[PDB]
Amino acid sequence: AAAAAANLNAVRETMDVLLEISRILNTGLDMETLSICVRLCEQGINPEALSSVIKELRKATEALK
Amino acid sequence: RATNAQFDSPEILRRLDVRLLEVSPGDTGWDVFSLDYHVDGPIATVFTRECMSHYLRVFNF
Amino acid sequence: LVSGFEATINKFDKNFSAHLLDLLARLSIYSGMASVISRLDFNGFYTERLERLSAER
Amino acid sequence: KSPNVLLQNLCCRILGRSEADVAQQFQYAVRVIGSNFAPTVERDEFLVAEKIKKELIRQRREADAALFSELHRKLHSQGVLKNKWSILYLLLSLSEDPRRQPSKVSS
């Protein structure tokens, strides 16, 4: 209806502002991977562990290319 | 002690300190290293916080 | 001769050195003051044995 | 969704592959993420905010350190974010210094 459409706008706004914070901090993420990491941090997860996981998967992506 | 800066009053030689910046990801120490000269007293009315931040911008260049 | 003695020597020398590490390392977190480490750890001796606990989590 | 199926989407976002292809890296990611799930430090957004302001102040980018102050308040203005500490702690850790070229987008 209407309240199911206002929430989609309010999520698109935040997912743009977080992308701006991500580009001024020069994180290598893009718009699609950031939506996975924001979803993960919603439920409650260690950023010290998830950041180590990303810092290793991007570290092992290069040995295969 | 190696240069002639040691031939000075021991007050102003003590007040100058190495300031560490906040730590950057992959970089060298030549981009993050600056002196701070720290000031505490009635002299801080002339050398306020606005002065030392602008001095650190000069040391940055 | 050595079965009773050197067995007591190595277990004491390992226990001495470990508590000597823990004295230096727990005094190294204290940033005059930090010089008690660098006096004990003079010119290259035992100033770099273990970096930190190789762990995570 | 669940976090176990959601980690595999991340393994297919970073590595460009399908779930039937990449399974050695996902086995590593379950090893790291599992047994390290619970928060180990106390949560506050205030300390992570004053560390990102520091992060932008001495990259000679004193302008973005005051723009982050206006972007961090909007996250509270909307209110769809429960754990604001975790995402900021994550976005600070993956940050890189460009050293230069802060080619400013917006708008």
UniProtKB/Swiss-Prot annotation, chain A:
The keyword Cytoplasm applies. It is found in: Cytoplasm, Cytoskeleton, Microtubule organizing center, Centrosome; Cytoplasm, Cytoskeleton, Spindle. Coiled coil: none annotated. It comes from the Eukaryota. Keywords: Acetylation, Cytoplasm, Cytoskeleton. One of its GO terms (biological process) is gamma-tubulin complex localization. One of its GO terms (cellular component) is centrosome. Belongs to the MOZART1 family. Required for the recruitment and the assembly of the gamma-tubulin ring complex (gTuRC) at the centrosome. The gTuRC regulates the minus-end nucleation of alpha-beta tubulin heterodimers that grow into microtubule protafilaments, a critical step in centrosome duplication and spindle formation. Associates with the gamma-tubulin ring complex (gTuRC) consisting of TUBGCP2, TUBGCP3, TUBGCP4, TUBGCP5 and TUBGCP6 and gamma-tubulin TUBG1 or TUBG2; within the complex, interacts with TUBGCP3 and TUBGCP6 to form a luminal bridge with actin that stabilizes the initial structure during complex assembly. Interacts with TUBG1. This is Mitotic-spindle organizing protein 1. It comes from Homo sapiens. The chain holds residues 11 to 75 of 82 of the full protein.
Swiss-Prot record, chain C:
Component of the gamma-tubulin ring complex (gTuRC) which mediates microtubule nucleation. The gTuRC regulates the minus-end nucleation of alpha-beta tubulin heterodimers that grow into microtubule protafilaments, a critical step in centrosome duplication and spindle formation. Plays a role in neuronal migration. It comes from the Eukaryota. Disulfide bonds: none annotated. This is Gamma-tubulin complex component 2. It is found in: Cytoplasm, Cytoskeleton, Microtubule organizing center, Centrosome. It is linked to Cortical dysplasia, complex, with other brain malformations 15: An autosomal recessive disorder characterized by global developmental delay, variably impaired intellectual development, speech delay, facial dysmorphism, microcephaly, and varying degrees of cortical malformations including pachygyria, thin corpus callosum and subcortical band heterotopia. Most patients have generalized seizures. The lineage of its organism: Eukaryota, Metazoa, Chordata, Craniata, Vertebrata. Ubiquitously expressed. Component of the gamma-tubulin ring complex (gTuRC) consisting of TUBGCP2, TUBGCP3, TUBGCP4, TUBGCP5 and TUBGCP6 and gamma-tubulin TUBG1 or TUBG2. TUBGCP2, TUBGCP3, TUBGCP4, TUBGCP5 and TUBGCP6 assemble in a 5:5:2:1:1 stoichiometry; each is associated with a gamma-tubulin, thereby arranging 14 gamma-tubulins in a helical manner. Gamma-tubulin at the first position is blocked by TUBGCP3 at the last position, allowing 13 protafilaments to grow into a microtubule. Belongs to the TUBGCP family.
UniProtKB/Swiss-Prot annotation, chain D:
It is found in: Cytoplasm, Cytoskeleton, Microtubule organizing center, Centrosome. The modification Phosphoserine is found at residue 107. Coiled coil: none annotated. Ubiquitously expressed. It comes from the Eukaryota. Component of the gamma-tubulin ring complex (gTuRC) which mediates microtubule nucleation. The gTuRC regulates the minus-end nucleation of alpha-beta tubulin heterodimers that grow into microtubule protafilaments, a critical step in centrosome duplication and spindle formation. Component of the gamma-tubulin ring complex (gTuRC) consisting of TUBGCP2, TUBGCP3, TUBGCP4, TUBGCP5 and TUBGCP6 and gamma-tubulin TUBG1 or TUBG2. TUBGCP2, TUBGCP3, TUBGCP4, TUBGCP5 and TUBGCP6 assemble in a 5:5:2:1:1 stoichiometry; each is associated with a gamma-tubulin, thereby arranging 14 gamma-tubulins in a helical manner. Gamma-tubulin at the first position is blocked by TUBGCP3 at the last position, allowing 13 protafilaments to grow into a microtubule. Belongs to the TUBGCP family. This is Gamma-tubulin complex component 3. The gene is TUBGCP3. The chain holds residues 7 to 113 of 907 of the full protein.
